[PDB]
Design a protein around this ligand. Structure first.
Ligand code: BCL
Ligand code: BCL
Ligand code: BCL
Ligand code: BCL
Ligand code: BCL
Ligand code: BCL
Ligand code: BCL
Ligand code: BCL
Ligand code: HEM
Ligand SMILES: CC(C)=CCC\C(C)=C/C=C\C(C)=C\C=C\C(C)=C\C=C\C=C(C)\C=C\C=C(C)\C=C\C1=C(C)C(=O)CCC1(C)C
Lengths: 57, 291, 38, 49, 32, 38, 35, 49, 38, 38
C-alpha cells in the first residue's frame, strides 16, 4: 500500500517533528498579524502583477 | 552582542536616512483634500472675476443659492466649484452675461452643474442628517465625488476588487432595510452567502477600518456597535442616488452622471468621513442640511 | 570523481530550458514587439 | 593524487584541483565582461547623476 | 519605539523556532 | 575535509544566480533606463 | 565547530547588507536611479 | 595536525588553519573597501548633516 | 552503461509532447489566426 | 529485455485515449460547429 515502509525508528521521529512544527508556525502567524499586516487580502495583491503575466490578460 | 549591535547600527541608519513622517493636510474647509495650487485656474479669468464682484451688488438671475452676495458667490465658486473639479474658470462660464447661455459659452455644462448643486442639497437634507452628534457635521460638496477631476471619474478602479470578480458590482436593486440578511434563513444556500461576503468585503475596503468596525463578529445580526445604523442610512442613500439621478427610467432618458453607479468608494476613498467632505459651517445655507 | 558528469548535464539542461521559457514569456507579455497581434 | 602543491596539500584532493582551476578561469572571464558591460551602461546613461 | 521592540520580539519568536533545528541536525550528524 | 569543495561551488552558483536575477528585476522594474518600451 | 561560525557569519552579513541597501534605496534621500 | 602554533594547538586542526587564513585575508580586504566606499558616500552627500 | 537509452527517449517524448501542446494552446488563445470562428 | 513491449502498448493506448478526449472536449466547447444545439 503506497510502496514505502518508513521503519520502526522513522515514524517516531516524524511524529515528534510534525507535532513540534505546527505550533511554531502558528505563533509566528499570530504575532505577525498583530504587528505588521492589517488585512490578508491586500497581501496577495502582488501575485497578479508578476511580470511573467502582468499584460497577457 | 554582535546581533544587537548590528540591529542598533541598522536602526540608527534608518532613522537618519529616512525622510520625515508626514503632517496631515490642514485646510480651513475640507477634512483632508486641498485645492492649493490655483495655476489650474487661469489668471486672466481671475482678473475678470474681480470686476464682476465689485461692479454689481447682487447676482442677477440665480435660480439656486438664493441668499448670497456676488462676492460670496464668487469666492464660493473659486473655492469649491472650480476647486472640486479643477476646471478652467471659463469651463462653464462666459466673460460677461454668464447668467444665461449665449454663443455656446461651453453650453450644456452650466445646466448639469446646476442640477448637481440641487442633487447635492437634496442628499444633504434627506440623508446626511442622521445621528448627527458624535458623528460630526461634515457635509457633501463638490470635492466629494470629484476629487479634483472634472469628468471621467471611475467608481470602481482596478486596484480595489483584487479578490472580487471584475464583473461584480454593488447590488442596489434591493430594499436594503435588511434585505441582505442571510443568517439562519433556511431558504438561501451558499451562493447567496457568497454574494453577501462580496458586498461586505467591499464595505471593508471602502472604510479605512477593519471588519470589526461595525459587526461584533460573535453574532453578526447584532446591532450593538451602532455603526451599522449609519451604514443602513448610507445604503438607502446610495440606492436613492442611483435610482433617482443615474437612471431615472433608463440612462438615456433624463439621466445625468452618464450612468455611473455610486459604488461607495468614490466618496470615502479609503477612509471614514471622506476627505472631500466639507467641515461643518463651510457650505452655503441652501446646500447644507439645515438651510 | 568529485562530480558526477550526468548531474551536471541534467542541471544544465533544466536551467537552460527554464531560462529560455521565462525570457520568452516576459518578452511576449511586455507587449513591445508587435508579435501575434500586438 | 599528489598533483597539488605542498602548501595546499591538506585541503585539496587531486580531482578537486582541476575543477578549481576551471572555476578561477571562469570567474576571471566573467569579471572582465562585467566591467566592460558596466562601462557601457555608464556611457549610455549614468545612474548616479 | 514601536518598531525596535517589534523586531526584538520577532527575534524571540525565531529563537523559539531554534531548538527543533538543532534536533534535526543532531539526528543527521549522529546517524551516518 | 574542513569544507567539501562541492558544497562551496553549489552554494556559490546558487547565490550568484539569485543575485543576478534579483538585480536584473529591480533594474527593470525601476523604470529608469528606457528598456523594452520605457 | 568552526564551520557553524562561518556559516552564521556569512548569512548574517549578507542579510544585513541587503537590508541596509533596501532601506537606503527606499528612503529616497540620495538621488540614485531617478530620484 | 601540527602546522598550527602551540598556543592555538588545542583549538585548531591542521586543515581548519588555512581556511582561517583565507577568512582573515578576505575580512581585511573587505574592511578596506568598506572604508573607501564610506569616504566616497560622505564626500558625495553627508548623511548626518 | 552510465546513460540508459530508454531514459533519454522517455524524457524526449514527454518534453516534445508538452512543448507541442503548449505552443498549440498559446497560438489558439492569441486570437490572431482566424481559426475556429475567430 | 531492453524495452518491454507491454509498457509501450499501455502508454500508447493511454496517451491516445487522453488525446482523443481532450480534442473532443475542446471542439465541443469552442461552439463553432452547431452540434447539440449550437
Ligand atoms: C555613503 C554611506 C551610506 C551607507 C550605506 C551603507 C551600505 C549600502 C552598506 C553599509 C554598510 C556598512 N556601514 Mg554604512 N553607510 C552610511 C552610514 C553609516 C554609518 C554612520 C553615518 O554612522 C555607519 C557607522 C555605517 C557603518 C557600516 C558598517 C557597519 C557596514 C560595513 C562594514 C562591514 O561589515 O564590513 C565590511 C563589509 C563586509 C560585510 C565584509 C566584506 C565581505 C566581502 C567583501 C564580500 C564581498 C563579496 C562580493 C559581494 C561578491 C564578489 C563577487 C564574486 C565574484 C561572487 N554606515 C551611509 C548611509 N552602509 C555595508 C554592510 O555591510 O552592511 C552590513 C553596506 O552594504
Ligand atoms: C475566525 C477565526 C479564525 C481562526 C483564528 C485563529 C487565531 C486568532 C488563532 C488561531 C490559532 C490556531 N488555529 Mg485558527 N482560526 C480559524 C480557523 C481554524 C481552523 C479551521 C478548520 O477552520 C483550524 C484547524 C485552525 C487551527 C489553528 C492552529 C493554526 C492554531 C492552534 C493553536 C495552537 O496550536 O496553539 C495554542 C497553544 C497554547 C496556547 C496552549 C498553551 C497550553 C499551556 C502550556 C497548558 C496550560 C495548562 C492548562 C492549564 C491545562 C492544565 C492541565 C490540568 C489537567 C488542568 N484554525 C478561524 C478562521 N486561529 C491560534 C494560534 O495561532 O496559535 C498561536 C491563534 O492564535
Ligand atoms: C529579441 C531580443 C530580446 C531578447 C529575447 C530573448 C529571448 C526570447 C531569448 C533570449 C535568450 C538569450 N538572450 Mg536575449 N533578448 C534581448 C536582449 C538580450 C541581451 C541584452 C541586450 O543585454 C542579452 C545579453 C541577451 C542574452 C541572451 C542569452 C542570455 C540567451 C541565449 C544565449 C545563448 O545563446 O543561449 C545559450 C545556448 C543555448 C540556448 C543552447 C540551445 C540548445 C539547443 C539548440 C536547443 C534546441 C531546442 C530544440 C528546439 C528542442 C528540439 C530539438 C530536438 C532535437 C528536436 N539578450 C532582447 C530583449 N533573448 C534565449 C534564452 O536564453 O533561452 C535559452 C531566449 O529564448
Ligand atoms: C539593464 C541594462 C541591460 C543589462 C545589464 C547587464 C549588465 C551590466 C550585466 C548583465 C549581465 C547579464 N545579463 Mg543583463 N542587462 C539587460 C537585459 C538582459 C537580458 C534581456 C532579457 O534583455 C538578458 C537575457 C540579460 C542576461 C544577462 C546575462 C547575459 C548576464 C548575467 C549572467 C548571470 O547572471 O548569470 C550568472 C549565473 C550563475 C552565477 C551560475 C551560472 C550557471 C552555470 C553557467 C551553469 C552551469 C552550472 C554547472 C552545471 C554546475 C551546476 C551547479 C548547480 C547550480 C548546483 N540581460 C539590460 C539590457 N546585464 C551581467 C553579465 O554579463 O556579467 C557576466 C552584467 O554584468
Ligand atoms: C547598468 C548599471 C546598473 C547595474 C545593473 C547590474 C545588473 C543588471 C547586474 C549587475 C551586476 C553586478 N553589479 Mg551592477 N549595476 C549598477 C551599479 C552597480 C554598482 C554601483 C554603482 O555601486 C556596483 C558596485 C555594481 C556591482 C555589480 C556586481 C555586484 C555584479 C557583477 C559583478 C561581477 O562581475 O560579477 C561576478 C562574476 C560573474 C557574474 C561570473 C559570471 C559567470 C559566467 C560568465 C556566467 C555566464 C552565464 C551564461 C550566459 C550562461 C550560459 C553559459 C553556458 C556555458 C552556455 N553595480 C547600475 C544600477 N549590475 C550583475 C550581477 O551580479 O549578476 C550576477 C547583474 O546581472
Ligand atoms: C547607496 C549609495 C551606494 C551604495 C553604498 C554602499 C556602501 C557605502 C557600501 C556598499 C557595499 C556594497 N555594495 Mg552598495 N551602494 C550602492 C548601490 C549598489 C549596487 C547597485 C545596484 O547599484 C550594488 C550592486 C551594490 C553592491 C554592493 C557590494 C559591492 C557591497 C556589499 C558587500 C556585501 O554586502 O556583501 C557581503 C556578503 C556576505 C557577508 C557574504 C559574502 C559571500 C561570500 C563572498 C561568497 C562565498 C561564500 C563561501 C562559498 C562560503 C559559503 C557560505 C554559505 C553562505 C553558507 N551597491 C549605492 C550606489 N554600497 C558595502 C561594501 O562594499 O563593503 C564591502 C559598502 O560598505
Ligand atoms: C503557424 C505558426 C505559429 C506556430 C505554431 C506552432 C504550432 C502549433 C506548433 C509549432 C511547433 C514548433 N514550432 Mg512553431 N509556430 C510559430 C512560430 C515559430 C517560430 C518563430 C517564428 O520563432 C519558431 C522557431 C517555431 C518553432 C517550432 C518548433 C519549436 C516546433 C516544431 C519543430 C519540429 O519540427 O518539431 C520537432 C519534431 C517533431 C515534432 C517530431 C514529430 C514526431 C511524429 C512525426 C509525430 C507524429 C504524430 C502523429 C500524428 C501521432 C500519430 C502517429 C501514429 C504512428 C499513427 N515556431 C507561429 C506562432 N509551431 C510544433 C511543436 O513543437 O509541437 C511538437 C507545434 O505543434
Ligand atoms: C472536424 C475537424 C476538427 C477536428 C476534430 C477532431 C476530433 C474530434 C478528433 C480529431 C482527431 C485527430 N485529428 Mg482532427 N480535427 C480538426 C483538425 C485537425 C487538424 C488540422 C487542420 O490541422 C489535424 C492535423 C488534425 C489531426 C488529428 C489527429 C491528430 C487525430 C486523429 C489522427 C488519427 O488517425 O488517429 C490515430 C489513430 C487512431 C485514433 C486509432 C483508433 C483506434 C481504434 C480504431 C479506436 C476504436 C475505438 C472504438 C470505438 C472503441 C470500441 C471498439 C471495441 C473493439 C468495440 N485534426 C478540426 C478542428 N480531430 C481524433 C483524435 O485524435 O482522437 C484519437 C479526434 O477524436
Ligand atoms: C458641486 C456641488 C458639483 C458640481 C458643480 C458638479 C458639476 C459637474 C459637472 C459640470 C459635471 C460634468 C463634467 C463634464 O464635462 O461632463 C459633473 C459630472 C458628474 N458629477 Fe458632479 N458636480 C458636483 C457635485 C457632485 C457630487 C457631490 C457628486 C457625487 C455623486 C457628483 C457626481 C458626478 C458624476 C458621477 C459625474 C459624471 C462623471 C462622468 O464620468 O460622467 N458631482 N458634475
Ligand atoms: C488541443 C490541441 C489543439 C492540442 C494540439 C496537440 C495535439 C492535438 C496532438 C499532439 C500530439 C499527438 C498527435 C498525439 C497523438 C497520439 C496518438 C495518436 C497516439 C496513438 C494512438 C494509437 C493508439 C492508442 C493505438 C493503440 C493500440 C491499441 C488500442 C491496441 C489495443 C489492443 C490491445 C493492446 C490488446 O491487448 C490486443 C488488441 C489490440 C491490439 C487492439
Amino acid at each position: 500500500i503506497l510502496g514505502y515502509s518508513i521503519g520502526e525508528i522513522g515514524i517516531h521521529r516524524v511524529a515528534f517533528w510534525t507535532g513540534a512544527a505546527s505550533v511554531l508556525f502558528s505563533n509566528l502567524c499570530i504575532f505577525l498579524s498583530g504587528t505588521f499586516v492589517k488585512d490578508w487580502n491586500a497581501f496577495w495583491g502582488f501575485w497578479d502583477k508578476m511580470p511573467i503575466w502582468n499584460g497577457v490578460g | 552582542v554582535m546581533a544587537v549591535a548590528s540591529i542598533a547600527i541598522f536602526w540608527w541608519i534608518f532613522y537618519t536616512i529616512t525622510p520625515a513622517p508626514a503632517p496631515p493636510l490642514q485646510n480651513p474647509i475640507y477634512v483632508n483634500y486641498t485645492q492649493e495650487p490655483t495655476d489650474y485656474i487661469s489668471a486672466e479669468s481671475l482678473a475678470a472675476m474681480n470686476a464682476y464682484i465689485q461692479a454689481n451688488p447682487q447676482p442677477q438671475a440665480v435660480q439656486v443659492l438664493k441668499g448670497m452676495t456676488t462676492a460670496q458667490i464668487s469666492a464660493y465658486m473659486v473655492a469649491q466649484v472650480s476647486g472640486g473639479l479643477k476646471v478652467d474658470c471659463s469651463y462653464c462660464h462666459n466673460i460677461a452675461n454668464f447668467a444665461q447661455q449665449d454663443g455656446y459659452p461651453n453650453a450644456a455644462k452650466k445646466v448639469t452643474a446646476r442640477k448637481m448643486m440641487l442633487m447635492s442639497a437634496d442628499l444633504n437634507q434627506n440623508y446626511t442628517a442622521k445621528l448627527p452628534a458624535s458623528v460630526g457635521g461634515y457635509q457633501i460638496t463638490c470635492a466629494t465625488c470629484h476629487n479634483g477631476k472634472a469628468a471621467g471619474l471611475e467608481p470602481y478602479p482596478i486596484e480595489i476588487m483584487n479578490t472580487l470578480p471584475n464583473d461584480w458590482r454593488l447590488p442596489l436593486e434591493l430594499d436594503y432595510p435588511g434585505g441582505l440578511v442571510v443568517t439562519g434563513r433556511k431558504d438561501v444556500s451558499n451562493h447567496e452567502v457568497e454574494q453577501n461576503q462580496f458586498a461586505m468585503y467591499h464595505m471593508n475596503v471602502s472604510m479605512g477600518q477593519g471588519c470589526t468596525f461595525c459587526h461584533n463578529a460573535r453574532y453578526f445580526p447584532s446591532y450593538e456597535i451602532a455603526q451599522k445604523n449609519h451604514s443602513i442610512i448610507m445604503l438607502q442613500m446610495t440606492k436613492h442616488i442611483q435610482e433617482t439621478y443615474v437612471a431615472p427610467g433608463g440612462r438615456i432618458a433624463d439621466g445625468i452622471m452618464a450612468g455611473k453607479s455610486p459604488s461607495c468608494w468614490l466618496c470615502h476613498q479609503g477612509a471614514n468621513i471622506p476627505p472631500g467632505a466639507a467641515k461643518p459651517g463651510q457650505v452655503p445655507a441652501v446646500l447644507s442640511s439645515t438651510p | 570523481r568529485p562530480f558526477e558528469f550526468r548531474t551536471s548535464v541534467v542541471v544544465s539542461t533544466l536551467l537552460g530550458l527554464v531560462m529560455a521559457l521565462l525570457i520568452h514569456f516576459v518578452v511576449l507579455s511586455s507587449g513591445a514587439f508587435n508579435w501575434l497581434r500586438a | 593524487n599528489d598533483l597539488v602543491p605542498d602548501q595546499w596539500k591538506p585541503l585539496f584532493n587531486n580531482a578537486q584541483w582541476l575543477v578549481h582551476d576551471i572555476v578561477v578561469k571562469t570567474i576571471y572571464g566573467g569579471l572582465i565582461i562585467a566591467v566592460i558591460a558596466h562601462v557601457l551602461c555608464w556611457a549610455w546613461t549614468p545612474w548616479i547623476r | 519605539m514601536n518598531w525596535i521592540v517589534a523586531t526584538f520580539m520577532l527575534m524571540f519568536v525565531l529563537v523559539a523556532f531554534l531548538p527543533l533545528v538543532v534536533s534535526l541536525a543532531y539526528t543527521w550528524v549522529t546517524n551516518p
